[PDB]
């Protein structure tokens, strides 16, 4: 606040930890910052770096750290801007097993400091990536990449200080990759060999063997987003062939077709369930990375990945029993992740809505498949918009109970999250409001008296889902929906009771003009 307008030349007071001077306006403080930026204590690096960025443009040059750093580096020497990176530990088979000696943890601390001191100056354009490499950085991380996956009550602290490194390594190769095109040719082949394209495969598929553990509550959260950030950063560099050749033998379609457990719904715990969950999380994050059909364009040309159709058929026929496949809190969760992955290859919508209508019957001690899952199915039918309702209402007479049930089951779920999206509800309302002709057999006379209360419930639902802003002035079948609403009021329709939920919808209607008002 105050001193940046009062950087005068007076007799200040010297601090602890410097040779003396006369005035110390800001230059001595920021020089102490820049020389002491390589403090290896990880709670201090962030604060020193952020203080550097917020403390450079207050010397009266009013510069920017992209140009002022080079303006110093031209006369300060290139050793000045690399001895901060160096550390005193630029360089043992007794550390092959995980050990917790006082030197080992401090060496990993040096590695973390030397790793992340360049991430902000590479993501920032303070110094371009030519003037930094043009070393022991690459050598030490290469040796650690060949010495990564190898006191059993205290060496897991060393294991935590191991697992904190590789993620920031990966994010450093992202910030070198997607900031300068020369880095596609600057990073030599001593690092982008099978080391990185083995450790990424181990990070995604089966990572509870290198030392990451489910029970870590923060790094397990922060991992599979920056890893997908890396895997999408790896398309502006020509190593996409390296990734495809390093992936397509392990998590490919052969693995999934062999790992479909012929006794799935049972007592098996780890090597089928954890492995299947790992690989579907891997393909989910690959689908987030946009590289899944760049792995598995599987079999044919019917706009249907045959492995995905096989996933749907095993999800169906697995529930097909002996007596009945019992459920769980994770035997359903594997099915949920299975369906969420299997509904991401291509369209796969008409297959679903044709499977749902099924006249087959089940005899236990046929439309039960909707009743279980019923949340992801409806939120995907939400996304397939403005045609799914039409291909539903194509059949509305032979199996009316199912079409009423599925319209309710999507409408309530679009109704529940009415405070986040707000557009799918009104669009679903407007795309169901212009489709009354497919259900004309409902709102007339000569009907069984269970359909009519369902139709009034449909009216109340699709009216309550929105407000009276887009109903009058002939919105859709507005006189047709009005005359179905009137022709509800027959005579042998209800004792009284069923009319009350009709009379509660009157504030929607009472804004019209003469004519029908007198009616």
UniProtKB/Swiss-Prot annotation:
Changing residue 275 to M: In a lung squamous cell carcinoma sample; somatic mutation. It is found in: Nucleus; Nucleus, Nucleolus; Cytoplasm, Cytosol. Residues 327-362 are annotated as: Interaction with C1D. Transmembrane segments: none annotated. It comes from the Eukaryota. The modification N6-acetyllysine is found at residue 70. Autophosphorylated at two clusters, the T2609 cluster and the S2056 cluster. Autophosphorylation induces a conformational change that leads to remodeling of the DNA-PK complex, requisite for efficient end processing and DNA repair. S-nitrosylated by GAPDH. Residues 327-362 are annotated as: Leucine-zipper. DNA-PK is a heterotrimer of PRKDC and the Ku dimer (composed of XRCC6/Ku70 and XRCC5/Ku86). Formation of this complex may be promoted by interaction with ILF3. Component of the core long-range non-homologous end joining (NHEJ) complex (also named DNA-PK complex) composed of PRKDC, LIG4, XRCC4, XRCC6/Ku70, XRCC5/Ku86 and NHEJ1/XLF. Additional component of the NHEJ complex includes PAXX. Following autophosphorylation, PRKDC dissociates from DNA. Interacts with DNA-PKcs-interacting protein (KIP) with the region upstream the kinase domain. Belongs to the PI3/PI4-kinase family. Serine/threonine-protein kinase that acts as a molecular sensor for DNA damage. Involved in DNA non-homologous end joining (NHEJ) required for double-strand break (DSB) repair and V(D)J recombination. Must be bound to DNA to express its catalytic properties. Promotes processing of hairpin DNA structures in V(D)J recombination by activation of the hairpin endonuclease artemis (DCLRE1C). Recruited by XRCC5 and XRCC6 to DNA ends and is required to (1) protect and align broken ends of DNA, thereby preventing their degradation, (2) and sequester the DSB for repair by NHEJ. It is linked to Immunodeficiency 26 with or without neurologic abnormalities: A form of severe combined immunodeficiency characterized by reduced or absent T and B cells, recurrent candidiasis, and lower respiratory tract infections. Some patients show dysmorphic features, severe growth failure, microcephaly, seizures, and impaired neurological functions. This is DNA-dependent protein kinase catalytic subunit. It comes from Homo sapiens.
